[PDB]
Amino acid sequence: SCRCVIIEKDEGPFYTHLGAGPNVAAIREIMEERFGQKGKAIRIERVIYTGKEGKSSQGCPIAKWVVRRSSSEEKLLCLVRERAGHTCEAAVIVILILVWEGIPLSLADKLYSELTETLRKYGTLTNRRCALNEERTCACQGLDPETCGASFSFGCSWSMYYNGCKFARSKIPRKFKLLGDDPKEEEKLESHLQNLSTLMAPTYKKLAPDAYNNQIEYEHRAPECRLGLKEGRPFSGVTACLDFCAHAHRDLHNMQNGSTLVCTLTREDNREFGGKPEDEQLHVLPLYKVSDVDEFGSVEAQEEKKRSGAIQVLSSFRRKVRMLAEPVKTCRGSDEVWSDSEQSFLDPDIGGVAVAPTHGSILIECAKRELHATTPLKNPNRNHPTRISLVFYQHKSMNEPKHGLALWEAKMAEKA
DNA sequence: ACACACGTGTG
DNA sequence: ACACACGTGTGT
Numbered sequence: 001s002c003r004c005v006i007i008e009k010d011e012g013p014f015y016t017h018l019g020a021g022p023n024v025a026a027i028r029e030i031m032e033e034r035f036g037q038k039g040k041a042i043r044i045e046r047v048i049y050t051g052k053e054g055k056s057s058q059g060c061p062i063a064k065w066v067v068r069r070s071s072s073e074e075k076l077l078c079l080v081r082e083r084a085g086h087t088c089e090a091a092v093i094v095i096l097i098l099v100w101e102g103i104p105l106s107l108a109d110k111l112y113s114e115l116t117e118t119l120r121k122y123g124t125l126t127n128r129r130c131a132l133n134e135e136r137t138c139a140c141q142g143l144d145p146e147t148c149g150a151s152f153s154f155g156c157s158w159s160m161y162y163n164g165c166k167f168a169r170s171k172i173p174r175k176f177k178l179l180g181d182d183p184k185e186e187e188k189l190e191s192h193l194q195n196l197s198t199l200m201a202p203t204y205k206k207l208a209p210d211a212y213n214n215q216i217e218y219e220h221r222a223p224e225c226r227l228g229l230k231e232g233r234p235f236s237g238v239t240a241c242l243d244f245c246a247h248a249h250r251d252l253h254n255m256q257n258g259s260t261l262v263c264t265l266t267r268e269d270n271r272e273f274g275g276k277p278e279d280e281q282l283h284v285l286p287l288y289k290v291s292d293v294d295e296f297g298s299v300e301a302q303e304e305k306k307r308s309g310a311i312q313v314l315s316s317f318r319r320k321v322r323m324l325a326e327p328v329k330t331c332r333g334s335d336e337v338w339s340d341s342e343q344s345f346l347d348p349d350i351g352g353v354a355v356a357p358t359h360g361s362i363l364i365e366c367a368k369r370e371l372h373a374t375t376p377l378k379n380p381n382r383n384h385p386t387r388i389s390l391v392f393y394q395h396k397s398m399n400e401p402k403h404g405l406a407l408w409e410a411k412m413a414e415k416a
Numbered sequence: 417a418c419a420c421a422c423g424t425g426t427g
Numbered sequence: 428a429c430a431c432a433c434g435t436g437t438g439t
């Protein structure tokens with residue numbers, strides 16, 4: 001759409017549905033309008049796309065810079081990318097929005113408790129490729145099967161076998177299936193996530209209207225493939241991640257021109273603004289580094305944030321981890337090894353920009369397009385997790401009524 | 417190209 | 428508890 005000219009990967013994935021404008025100043029104007037507040041309440045960080053991925057010696061997620069909530073006065077964090085070379089009307093795009101005070105703290109406290117107890121006792125683990133490094137030998141979730149970090153997926157999901165909702169053949173699908181057949185437990189679980197899906201829809205509409213609008217386009221066509229209890233239902237699936245290390249990946253089944261909302265819950269020792277948690281999980285963009293200047297282009301302003309901790313400049317580590325003796329085999333013992341990261345820290349252009357999302361916060365990013373990851377916990381324990389994330393998304397080709405049951409019957413009706 | 421996947425209902 | 432049928436996109 002611009003004659004800056006064409007457009008490549010050197011500048012990063014291009015999209016505007018989280019927001020775009022000719023300069024950082026214009027982004028503040030958009031965000032102040034959406035959020036209803038001007039000034040210190042909104043924080044914008046410029047991040048530079050380098051295309052060079054930060055990872056450990058074993059190929060597992062690491063951070064290099066941590067963007068942390070600067071003060072209780074900061075309500076909304078915005079990460080932006082100024083696209084290299086562009087002077088057009090979409091020169092600066094929004095790649096992540098973080099609402100610090102996303103849901104009520106009393107609900108976050110209760111969801112932390114309810115989801116942990118329900119899922120550890122009744123949850124069916126969902127196997128995902130991003131649970132493992134590329135060599136598939138790492139142990140970032142932990143090795144105790146009773147306690148290891150894990151991911152549980154609910155709602156509707158896309159299926160290559162139907163090119164549509166996996167529930168195409170299910171009379172009365174179970175969107176929140178738990179081990180056994182305890183309907184009362186599944187209904188409680190369902191009610192919590194349906195309620196939360198209902199609470200977050202308006203927050204999504206408010207802060208990322210274009211993305212939100214794309215996700216409700218076929219709401220009245222495929223309502224069986226949407227969550228939520230009130231008009232305006234952008235979400236289709238929800239995944240709960242309990243101390244789960246999501247290795248660098250993109251959410252490739254996600255619908256184009258959408259986004260994912262991540263609601264973070266944290267263990268009880270990490271719920272005060274100025275607190276030293278024994279551990280914490282971070283959300284990382286491994287292809288980005290931080291700028292030398294703040295939102296307004298001041299070097300000293302950026303240096304003040306570095307020494308204040310609002311941007312935590314991390315340093316290299318050398319730790320001992322476990323490596324599986326055999327890789328985990330695909331759908332189709334252990335030994336100790338050193339894991340380093342000096343190499344990611346020696347190159348200033350190897351990326352690793354992390355945010356530290358708080359209890360009850362809401363994170364919005366286009367996970368289909370941006371490589372993203374979560375850091376492994378020191379002692380993962382899904383029975384008492386350091387962090388729970390609830391990832392709300394809509395997969396592609398989820399626009400048929402009744403989970404696509406009509407097209408499937410019509411499909412098999414092409415018979416001989 | 418081509419290995420791989422936030423699966424489920426049949427029998 | 429198993430086997431089998433159904434078959435898409437992407438990043439590289």
Ligand SMILES: O=C(O)CNC(=O)C(=O)O
Pocket residue numbers: 151239241246251262282283367372373374389390391
């Ligand atoms: O929990 C987070 O912050 C990110 N989670 C994911 O990217 C995922 O499970 O696909």
Ligand SMILES: [Fe+2]
Pocket residue numbers: 246249250251367372
């Ligand atoms: Fe993801």
Ligand SMILES: [Zn+2]
Pocket residue numbers: 059060061132133138139140245247
């Ligand atoms: Zn790993």
Ligand SMILES: [Zn+2]
Pocket residue numbers: 002003004005085086087088089090091
């Ligand atoms: Zn341009």
Ligand SMILES: [Zn+2]
Pocket residue numbers: 156157165166167224225226402403
């Ligand atoms: Zn469905």
